[PDB]
């Protein structure tokens, strides 16, 4: 939920580990995502 709010083309799902998926994302969005990666160790990009 926190990452969904902060990010809010990227799609967020729960699965077993929180998963982020997107087809054509700008490099800034990818950088923001990998920065938010430090919030939770079990994230799948």
């Amino acid at each position: 939920e926190e990452m969904r709010e902060l990010m809010g083309a990227k799609i967020r799902v729960v699965g077993d580990h929180v998963v982020v998926d997107g087809k054509n994302l700008a490099p800034t969005t990818l950088a923001r995502v990998r920065a938010l990666q430090a919030l939770y160790p079990k994230t799948i990009v």
Binding site: L6, T28, A31, R32, A35, L36
Partner: protein
């Protein structure tokens, strides 16, 4: 999560340069120029005793 700007807007500076120069000259060459080295007197002697 903050990102930097692509670049920074700098102040623009206008330079105005002036280079001024004046030259003046005078040349004169006047009078009479004479010879200062001339031939001098000569003397010669010759004899046959025998």
């Amino acid at each position: 999560l903050a990102t930097p700007s692509p670049f920074d807007m700098e102040k623009m500076v206008w330079l105005d340069v002036n280079i001024l120069e004046i030259r003046k000259s005078v040349l004169e060459n006047f009078g009479v120029d004479w010879s200062k080295q001339i031939p001098g007197p000569f003397a010669a002697f010759g004899k046959d005793f025998v």
